[PDB]
């Protein structure tokens, strides 16, 4: 949602780095694009999929996770 | 907004679903 | 060694448990004119086979409840069942109809056991037999 | 490392299990298995 | 067929059932190769597994709910019931087996002999104060066991 | 272990017997041809898979073929 | 003759040598009584033989060499890491003895029966964990171990 | 049993390893007439005895290479090797020469295997055999 | 205790050393030795 309200200059989010071999440099360094955490840069293309096709909201993306779990099973 | 807590323990509730019915297709392929 | 089919049976939690190969169980065998259907003295209904059928069992109850069945249920009296004691080491001890005669029925060679020959009240006082071991119906 | 997501303790607990518990009791099984001579 | 649900081991007079709860592979295949059960062990090693197991999850209920839970010494007294708890335990193992095997000893399992239950006893003991106090260690130590696990100190 | 078939083109030259470390073929009795002699593989068993006795044999398109199979400790040459 | 080097046990076509380092005196009467290899030893005591030496010695690296060797719980962080290293261990020595001890059980070894090898990581499980909790008390309580060494108490 | 004399020598790194006392191992026995040093195929030089000579190998292609040595590799060619196939259990099997006779020669009562009544290039397509088990040289 | 001299920590190491391991080794060795009742 934060890149929602800006797709131009704000970095995607892949997901969130849990590495308990991090130094405080590689901590400082990885907590990027707006985040508290260290996280990953995604480059795949996603966000601007699913801003595309007019998602806007986490919680339409945990339904559908919830949804494509349901239809795996 | 995110998510919340029970929210995500709740998608982990549902994904033991896939996991069973996974660990049920395999041994099934496997014999 | 005991002969006949076993009656052909889903399976229940009622049948034999521990007992049946620490200690003993119990087997009945009867003849078979038909294919028809039973009820197990252990709960549900089983279909017992054309010919012989062996059934084990964990008491001796349960074999003369079937039997009882066996002789009272069917419109051809099933009266040919032979009831068996059998043993974890193999040893198999014919019981009922002990003699080939049902007990309802009198036969010679019968020996009158626990038979007393006097009455119910004359049975001696407890105090007359005190620090003897022995109760009074067994004097 | 800490997260500001909702459950953070929940890759304080998954990392290990997925890092150590997860392949260390598959390759044991795996390792039981492939090494059974039971029939062929 | 379909069904399933059959007899217990092939023989429909015997008081049980085939199920997918009792006679599944998967069932077979995780109680015979539980510690109590699996194939080769010695008893000692069964009882160590069972003991260690049972030890380090016994540390919980009263480290968290018991009566010192809200002093300083919550992990002592959780730590001080659970070897409590496995000493009555292995104690009463240890009763179980010498009532138990008086007699003649089977020429089956190992475990069910006075030898081998004594050995089981031994294990379980040796476990579970064991798992106690691994568990009481990771419990007291909580914090650095969380910076290890956030890459605090590194 | 693998397998050593021979085929009608053996002229009995005995090369791939000579050429084999491993004793698996013999030379028996023929009429196909002038040497009245054709290659035979009792001892597949001990056969490793070389193909010395491919490269020894002189017909075009060889009379002996080794087919490479299932492998033993025979077969994959091991002392251990 | 004066030639150390002779074939091993007398058969000069078995792949060994008979050399001061493979078969010297010192060399049977040290190997043949490690706990291993020691005459009448039940494969618990083996195990916990060599899981205490092992468990011992496993502290040090991450004691010294560790990512928490310059926090205040650098002793803690080798501690755990010996710890986790001999469960590993174990568990390695376990699922081998199942996958090797299969079939029969010969009649020379005990150790080397699925009992016996049960028993014998049971013992380095045991020790193993003991060694290292053993070690780690040294080290914790340096200070003490320092004082007793020069007679400062007393 | 095997008889002969073991050849002496030093001992080797290159010898039997447990596969010998734990599937198979391999005996070549061979008369000399004169004590001369042969090359060991596990590296390194040996002295046979003068008369029978016994060795044992690892593999069944070493006792061939020591008897391809044995041929050709003397003046006087030692041409009586037999070669053996030992087990743990203690059966000696005869493997080389089999019939008496070196391979390169032909015999009577040999019988032929491995041998097709096709060509080569007769053999039949894969497409043909799918599902079956067996190659296009098995057919 | 202490010492003045060069690698004070070789007598904080080698009393013990030469008091308790040492003879407890050979004692024990001995004693393993001349129990044994191998051949005389
Ligand atoms: C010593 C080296 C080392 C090690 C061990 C790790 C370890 C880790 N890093 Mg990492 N990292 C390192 C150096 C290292 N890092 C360095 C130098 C950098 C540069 C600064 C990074 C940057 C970095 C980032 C940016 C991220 C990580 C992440 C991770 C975690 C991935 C765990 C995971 O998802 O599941 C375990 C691993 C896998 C599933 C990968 C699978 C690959 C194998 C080969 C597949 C094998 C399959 C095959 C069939 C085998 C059979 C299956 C088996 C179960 C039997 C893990 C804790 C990620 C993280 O935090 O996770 C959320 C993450 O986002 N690291
Ligand atoms: C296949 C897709 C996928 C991938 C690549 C990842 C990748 C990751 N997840 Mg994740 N996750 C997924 C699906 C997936 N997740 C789903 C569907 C759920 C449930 C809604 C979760 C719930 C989840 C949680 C709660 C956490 C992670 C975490 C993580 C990270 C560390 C690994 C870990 O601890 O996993 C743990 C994962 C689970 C316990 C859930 C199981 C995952 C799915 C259901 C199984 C998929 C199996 C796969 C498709 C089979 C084929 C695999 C292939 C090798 C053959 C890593 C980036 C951790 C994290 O955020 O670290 C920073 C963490 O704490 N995941
Ligand atoms: C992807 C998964 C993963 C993860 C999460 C880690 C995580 C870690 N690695 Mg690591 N590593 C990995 C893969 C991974 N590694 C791989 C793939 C390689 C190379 C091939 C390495 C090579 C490597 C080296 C060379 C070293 C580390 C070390 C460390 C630890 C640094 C902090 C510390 O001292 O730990 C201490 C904590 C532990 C070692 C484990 C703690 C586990 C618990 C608390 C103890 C056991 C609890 C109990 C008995 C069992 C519970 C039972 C039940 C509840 C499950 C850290 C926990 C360092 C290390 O181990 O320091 C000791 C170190 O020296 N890593
Ligand atoms: C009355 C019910 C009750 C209560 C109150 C508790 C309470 C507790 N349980 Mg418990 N438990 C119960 C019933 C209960 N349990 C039952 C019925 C079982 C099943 C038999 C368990 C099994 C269980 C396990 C297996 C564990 C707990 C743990 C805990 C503690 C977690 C809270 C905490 O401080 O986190 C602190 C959390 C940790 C210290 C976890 C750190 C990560 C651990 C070491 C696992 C990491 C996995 C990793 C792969 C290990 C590496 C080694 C090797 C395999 C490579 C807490 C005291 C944990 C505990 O006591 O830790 C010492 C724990 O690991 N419980
Ligand atoms: C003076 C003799 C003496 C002493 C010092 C001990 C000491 C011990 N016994 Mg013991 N025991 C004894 C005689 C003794 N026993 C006799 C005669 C029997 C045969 C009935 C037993 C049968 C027995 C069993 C079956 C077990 C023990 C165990 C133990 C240990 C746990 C602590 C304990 O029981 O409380 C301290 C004990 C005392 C202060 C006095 C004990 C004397 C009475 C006769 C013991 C009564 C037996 C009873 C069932 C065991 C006590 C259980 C405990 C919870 C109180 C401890 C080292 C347990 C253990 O972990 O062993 C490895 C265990 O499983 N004992
Ligand atoms: C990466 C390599 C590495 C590293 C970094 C270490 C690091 C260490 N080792 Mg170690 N070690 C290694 C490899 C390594 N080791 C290997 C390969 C072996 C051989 C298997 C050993 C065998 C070894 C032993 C046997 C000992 C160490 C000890 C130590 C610690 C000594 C430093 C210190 O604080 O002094 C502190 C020094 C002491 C506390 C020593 C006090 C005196 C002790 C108790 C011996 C006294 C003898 C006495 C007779 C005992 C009485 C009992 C009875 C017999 C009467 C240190 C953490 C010592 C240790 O961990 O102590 C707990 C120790 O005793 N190491
Ligand atoms: C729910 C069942 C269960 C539980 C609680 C345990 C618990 C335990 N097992 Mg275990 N085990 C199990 C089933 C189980 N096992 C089965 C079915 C097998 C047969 C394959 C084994 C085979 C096995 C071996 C060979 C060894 C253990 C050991 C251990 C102890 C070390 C901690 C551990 O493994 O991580 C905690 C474990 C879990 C949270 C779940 C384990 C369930 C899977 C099926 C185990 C997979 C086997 C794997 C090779 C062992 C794990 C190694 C570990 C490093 C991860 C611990 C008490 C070791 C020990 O010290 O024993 C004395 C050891 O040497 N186990
Ligand atoms: C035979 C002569 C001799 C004698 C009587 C002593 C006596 C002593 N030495 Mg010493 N030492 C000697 C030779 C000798 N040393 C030599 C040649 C060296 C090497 C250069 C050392 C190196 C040495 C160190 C480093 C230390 C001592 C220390 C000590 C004191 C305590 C014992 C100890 O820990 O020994 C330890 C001794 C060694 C580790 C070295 C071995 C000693 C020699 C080489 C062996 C001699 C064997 C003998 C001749 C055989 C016959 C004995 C007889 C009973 C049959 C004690 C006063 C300690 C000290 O200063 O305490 C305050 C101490 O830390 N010594
Ligand atoms: C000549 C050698 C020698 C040395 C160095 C000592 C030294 C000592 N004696 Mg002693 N003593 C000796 C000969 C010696 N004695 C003799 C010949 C006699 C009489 C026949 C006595 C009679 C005596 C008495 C009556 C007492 C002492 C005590 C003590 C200790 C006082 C401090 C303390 O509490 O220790 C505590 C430390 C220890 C007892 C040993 C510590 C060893 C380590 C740290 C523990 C084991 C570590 C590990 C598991 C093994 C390491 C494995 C590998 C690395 C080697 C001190 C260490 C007192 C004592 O023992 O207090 C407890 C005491 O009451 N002594
Ligand atoms: C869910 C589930 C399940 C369950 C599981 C469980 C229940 C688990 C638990 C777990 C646990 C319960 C674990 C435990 C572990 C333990 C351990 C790991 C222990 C250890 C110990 C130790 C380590 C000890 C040692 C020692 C000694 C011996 C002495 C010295 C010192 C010490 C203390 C260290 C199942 C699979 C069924 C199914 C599916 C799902
Ligand atoms: S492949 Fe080698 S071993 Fe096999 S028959 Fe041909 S030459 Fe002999
Ligand atoms: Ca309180
Ligand atoms: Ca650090």
């Known amino acids: 949602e934060q890149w929602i309200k800006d797709p131009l200059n704000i970095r995607p989010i892949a997901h969130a780095i849990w590495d308990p071999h991090f130094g405080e440099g590689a901590v400082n360094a990885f907590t990027q694009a707006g985040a508290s955490n260290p996280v990953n840069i995604a480059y795949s293309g996603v966000y601007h999929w699913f801003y595309t096709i007019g998602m806007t909201t986490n919680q339409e993306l945990y339904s559908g996770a919830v949804f494509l779990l349901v239809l795996a099973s | 907004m995110a998510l919340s807590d029970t929210q995500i323990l709740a998608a982990l509730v549902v994904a033991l679903l896939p996991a069973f019915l996974a660990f049920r297709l395999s041994t099934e392929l496997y014999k | 060694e005991l002969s006949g089919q076993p009656p052909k049976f889903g399976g229940s939690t009622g049948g034999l448990l521990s007992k049946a ?26 279909i017992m086979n054309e010919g012989e059928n062996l059934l084990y069992l964990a ?57 007393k020959t006097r009455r119910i009240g004359q049975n001696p006082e407890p105090v007359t037999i005190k620090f003897s071991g022995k109760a009074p119906y067994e004097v | 490392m800490d997260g500001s997501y909702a459950a953070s303790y929940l890759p304080w607990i998954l990392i290990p299990m997925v890092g150590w518990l997860f392949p260390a009791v598959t390759m044991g ?10 029939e062929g | 067929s379909n069904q399933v649900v059959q007899a217990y081991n092939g023989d429909p007079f015997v008081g049980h059932l085939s199920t997918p709860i009792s006679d599944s592979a998967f069932t077979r295949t995780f109680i015979g190769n539980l510690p109590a059960y699996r194939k080769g062990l010695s008893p000692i090693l069964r009882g160590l597994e069972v003991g260690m197991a049972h030890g380090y999850f016994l540390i919980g209920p009263w480290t968290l709910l018991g009566p010192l839970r809200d002093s300083e010494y919550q992990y002592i007294g959780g730590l001080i019931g659970a070897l409590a708890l496995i000493l009555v335990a292995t104690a009463a193992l240890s009763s179980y087996g010498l009532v138990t095997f008086q007699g003649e000893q089977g020429s089956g ?28 260690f990771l419990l007291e130590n909580l914090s650095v066991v969380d910076g290890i696990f956030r890459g605090l100190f590194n | 272990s693998h397998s050593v078939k021979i ?74």
């Open chain 3, 21 to 46: 190969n620490r200690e003993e169980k119990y087997a009945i065998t009867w003849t078979s004119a038909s294919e028809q259907v039973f009820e197990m003295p252990t709960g549900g209904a089983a």
């Open chain 3, 59 to 115: 008491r001796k109850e349960q074999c003369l409840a079937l039997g009882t069945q066996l002789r009272t249920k069917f419109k051809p009296k099933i009266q040919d069942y032979k009831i068996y004691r059998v043993y974890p080491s193999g040893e198999v001890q014919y019981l009922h109809p002990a003699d080939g005669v049902f007990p309802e029925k009198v036969n010679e060679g019968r020996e009158a056991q626990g038979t």
């Open chain 4, 29 to 38: 099984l795996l390792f039981i298995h492939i090494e059974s001579e039971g």
């Open chain 5, 109 to 136: 399992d190992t475990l069910q002999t006075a030898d081998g239950w004594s050995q089981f006893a031994a294990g379980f003991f040796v476990g579970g104060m064991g798992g106690a106090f691994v568990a009481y």
């Open chain 6, 7 to 80: 085929y009608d083109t053996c002229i009995g030259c005995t090369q791939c017997v000579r050429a084999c470390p491993l004793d698996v073929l013999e030379m028996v009795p023929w009429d196909g041809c002038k040497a009245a002699q054709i290659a035979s593989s009792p001892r597949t068993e001990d056969c490793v898979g070389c193909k010395r006795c491919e490269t020894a044999c002189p017909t075009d398109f060889l009379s002996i073929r080794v087919y490479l199979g299932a492998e033993t400790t025979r077969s994959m040459g091991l002392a251990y």
